[PDB]
Amino acid sequence: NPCGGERYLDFLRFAVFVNGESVEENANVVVRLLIRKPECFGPALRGEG
Amino acid sequence: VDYLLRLQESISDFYWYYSGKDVIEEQGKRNFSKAMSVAKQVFNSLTE
Amino acid sequence: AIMSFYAALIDLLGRCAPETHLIQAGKGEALRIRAILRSLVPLDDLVGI
Amino acid sequence: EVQFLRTDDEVVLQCSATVLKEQLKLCLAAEGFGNRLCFLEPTSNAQNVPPDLAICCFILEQSLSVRALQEMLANHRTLLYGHAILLRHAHSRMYLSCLTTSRSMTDKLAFDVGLQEDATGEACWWTMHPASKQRSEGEKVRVGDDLILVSVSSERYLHLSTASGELQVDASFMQTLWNMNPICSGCEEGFVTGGHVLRLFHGHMDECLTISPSDSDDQR
Amino acid sequence: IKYGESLCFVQHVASGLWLTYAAPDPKALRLGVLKKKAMLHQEGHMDDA
């Protein structure tokens, strides 16, 4: 579902970037969660295939 | 006992956070004091 | 939709990327996060897109 | 009491794989000198073909909490889930680490696992996590427990890769369950233990058991 | 044997097989299958009690 994925990614973008600068805490948490659930990267960035 | 273990691990983490620093700031001191008061109450509970 | 999802994902990761002042200070967390992001997204793919 | 792993204990990192509907046990192994890359040594057929355990043995040098590790990097304990462990290769005295190179042709996000000469940096530190709800963070790691190892530097799991035809070990984002089976804990002074290199002298006559010198007619 | 406290392994007497959970089948997580089929296995697992 790329369409819904884009909406959730937009919310995460607004959560991690504030006033032209990256919020380090939120950025690190988001990166850790994304790598712990690799399916969030879409089929293209799947490790194996 | 389980809660006491969790609190002890949190306090150890706080100590490791502040170990390098020469002096603990006021905010860290206040958090340490709150944790120590809670631990005091838990120790009293186990004693009773 | 697929292109937009991947663009949003890349935007989110780029915004999660650490700040230059942190990188210069050499913070281990910042360096680790940047290494993770670089491993996730190759430079050649960005240039090709 | 349930036996607990402690620092300075010798262990082997064991995993299981289903091959032709047969459960095969494999130990993490590495030579160190001449090849830093880690591989998997099967140990299920030991009755027919002995395994090469000397290069599989590892020593638990250190075990720290994450904050303690951060402080140490900036500047016999029982293992607890959530702690970061340092593993020294018994033979080469190098340290198990997550390398920055990757020779995997299947996984594009995986990293090679090998040995590193020194214990500097975070590449040589691995965090232990429970494999099931039976154990939780802060609990002591018991002998025979299945655990997950996460690289501190790369945030990747010590993973058994069966994608290709051969069984490989690498640092990927897919988890694998490992067993830290104990080899030895502590030897009484002056007593012989298995897995030790020694000489067999004829009584006390200064005659030792041996084979013919190199390049002999008996083929040694 | 005590209620709650005692941890017991269930063994089939005739065969000696141990009551355990079947290996998590693929796509069950995606289907939302929170239930794990139970089986009798020669070795079982450590958390079979």
Contact flag D109-C32 (C-beta cutoff 8 Å): no
Residue B9 assigned as binding residue: no
Burial class (CB in 10 A: 0-12, 13-18, 19+), D92: middle
Q: The tokens of D110 are what?
A: 């995986």
Distance, in angstroms, between D79 CA and closest chain E CA? 19
**Half-sphere CA count of B27, side-chain side, radius 13 A:** 0
∠ CA E30-A29-B7, nearest 5°, is 100
Q: Closest-CA residue in chain D for B5?
A: D138
Q: Closest-CA residue in chain C for D110?
A: C39
Chains that touch E (3 or more CB pairs under 8 A): D
Chains that touch C (3 or more CB pairs under 8 A): A, D
CA distance D84 to D78: 12
Resolution (A): 2.4
Is D134 in contact with D81 (CB distance < 8 Å)?
no
Q: Which of D128, D126, D148 is closest to D138 using CA atoms?
A: D128
∠ CA D11-D177-D39, nearest 5°, is 60
∠ CA D16-D150-C11, nearest 5°, is 125
CA-CA-CA-CA dihedral for A44, A46, A47, A49, to nearest 10? -70
Amino acid found at D17: A
Q: Which residues of C touch A10 (CB under 8 A)?
A: 8
What is the number of other CB atoms lying within 10 angstroms of the CB of residue B42?
A: 15
CA distance D168 to D162: 6
Query: Which structural technique was applied?
Result: cryo-EM
Three-state DSSP at D205 gives: coil
Please list, residue by residue across D4-22, b when 16 or more beta carbons sit within 10 angstroms of its beta carbon and e when fewer do. bbbbebbbbbbbbbeeeee
Chains that touch B (3 or more CB pairs under 8 A): D
- Cα–Cα distances in angstroms (integers) from residue D67 to residues B12, B13, D152, in the given order: 9, 6, 12
CA distance D163 to D5: 32
Is A5 in contact with A34 (CB distance < 8 Å)?
no
Contact flag C1-A21 (C-beta cutoff 8 Å): no
Give the list of residues 6+ apart from residue D134 with CB closer than 8 angstroms, or none. Answer: E46, E47
Distance, in angstroms, between E39 CA and closest chain D CA? 16
Crossing angle (nearest 10°) for helices A2-16 and C2-16: 20
Helix (H) or strand (E) holding D25: strand D22-29
List, in sequence order, every residue forming a beta bridge with D62; answer none if it has no partner.
D86
Q: Closest-CA residue in chain D for E48?
A: D134
∠ CA C29-C30-C31, nearest 5°, is 95
Q: Closest-CA residue in chain A for D109?
A: A47
Q: What is the DSSP letter of B35?
A: H
Is D60 in contact with D5 (CB distance < 8 Å)?
yes
Distance, in angstroms, between D176 CA and closest chain A CA? 14
Q: What is the DSSP letter of D183?
A: E
Contact of D104 with chain C, judged by CB distance below 8 Å, is answered with: no
Distance, in angstroms, between C47 CA and closest chain A CA? 16
Give the list of residues 6+ apart from residue D151 with CB closer than 8 angstroms, or none. Answer: D98, D111, D123, D125, D126, D157, D158, D171
Contact of D177 with chain A, judged by CB distance below 8 Å, is answered with: no
Interface test with E, best of D3, D134, D174 (most E CBs within 10 A): D134
Interface test with D, best of E36, E42, E46 (most D CBs within 10 A): E46
Contact flag D138-B6 (C-beta cutoff 8 Å): yes
Q: Which residue has the tokens 């993973």?
A: D159
Largest Cα–Cα separation, chain B:
38
Is D110 in contact with D172 (CB distance < 8 Å)?
yes
Burial class (CB in 10 A: 0-12, 13-18, 19+), B34: exposed
Interface test with C, best of D155, D157, D172 (most C CBs within 10 A): D155
Contacting B residues, span 1-40, partner chain D, CB-CB under 8 Å: 5-6, 9, 12-13, 16-17, 19-20
CA distance D111 to D124: 13
Interface test with D, best of C39, C41, C44, C45 (most D CBs within 10 A): C39
- Cα–Cα distances in angstroms (integers) from residue D53 to residues D2, D110, D141, D196, in the given order: 25, 26, 23, 11
